Write a protein that binds this ligand. Structure first.
Ligand SMILES: CC(C)CCC(=O)N[C@H](Cc1ccc(NC(=O)CCc2ccc(Cl)cc2)cc1)C(=O)N1CCC(C)CC1
Ligand code: NA
Length: 259
């Protein structure tokens, strides 16, 4: 590529992200004052473990769907073969969500936007995975210190998804070329905005990998406790990406093929 193409890729990636960001940043900031009362927090704690899991699985699925749409709009993604598109999404969609949610996190009071209001870790105690919850909050606390702009999140999450090292890629060279151009765009934008200092503060890939593994592991614990809840009340896309043996569903293939 050349310089004019990279500048175009920067605006292309930032545009695809704005069209699929799920929640605009200003809308998330305007809600920061709206925090669950101590009686509303106790209500969430009084909910059953199985109800909190399906409510969280529903919100995770909604977020993942926007990441799929981000991928389809992402320059060069739909040119890859379908096997590679599915490998990249299965490996990275959750990782993109884990990065995106820092916008919905308030580092001042350590709360996240959940079901119309902001609440802390104590809101999710009924899940029975306090270690995973605190790892999630800590990860959002870390990214919040970086003070990401919307353009930086756009370019970073594009690279989280377009990773030529994902096992199972049939056209590794083709993903490499797309990843190299997206790297150039991200680094060129950081250079122009004088934000190259964030490169050393970005979390290691093994951290996002550890969070996704913690999610699958705690789901397997819950699935053992309430297998019918997962089969009957969890979204099909969620089961395809996280539940064994739930990969039998093909949701993503339909999501990608349409339009
Ligand atoms: C920029 C916007 C798109 C950000 C919008 C946004 O906030 N999305 C996330 C999605 C989400 C949902 C659930 C989790 N995990 C859990 O609840 C733990 C249980 C678990 C374990 C394993 C699996 Cl596989 C699935 C669930 C992680 C993330 C979100 O809604 N929240 C609110 C509550 C959680 C605790 C933090 C983040
Ligand atoms: Na933040």
């Amino acid at each position: 590529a050349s310089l004019t193409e990279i500048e175009h890729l920067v605006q292309s990636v930032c545009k695809s992200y704005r069209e699929t960001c799920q929640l605009r940043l200003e809308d998330l900031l305007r809600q920061r004052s709206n925090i669950f009362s101590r009686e509303e927090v106790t209500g969430y704690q009084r909910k059953s473990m199985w109800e909190m899991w399906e409510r969280c699985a529903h919100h995770l699925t909604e977020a993942i769907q926007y990441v799929v749409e981000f991928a389809k709009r992402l320059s060069g993604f739909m040119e890859l073969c379908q096997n590679d598109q599915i490998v990249l999404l299965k490996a990275g969609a959750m990782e993109v969500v884990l990065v995106r949610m820092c916008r919905a996190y308030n580092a001042d009071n350590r709360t996240v936007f959940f079901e119309g209001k902001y609440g802390g870790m104590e809101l999710f105690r009924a899940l029975g995975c306090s270690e995973l919850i605190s790892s999630i909050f800590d990860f959002s606390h870390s990214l919040s210190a970086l003070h990401f702009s919307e353009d930086e999140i756009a370019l970073y999450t594009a690279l989280v998804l377009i990773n030529a090292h994902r096992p199972g890629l049939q056209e590794k060279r083709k993903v490499e070329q797309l990843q190299y151009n997206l790297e150039l765009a991200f680094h060129h934008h950081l250079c122009k905005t004088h934000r190259q200092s964030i490169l050393a503060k970005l979390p290691p890939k093994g951290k996002l990998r550890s969070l996704c593994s913690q999610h699958v592991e705690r789901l397997q614990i819950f699935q053992h406790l309430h297998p019918i809840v997962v089969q009957a009340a969890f979204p099909p896309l969620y089961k395809e990406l996280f539940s064994g043996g739930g990969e039998k569903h093909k949701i993503l293939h339909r999501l990608l093929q349409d339009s």
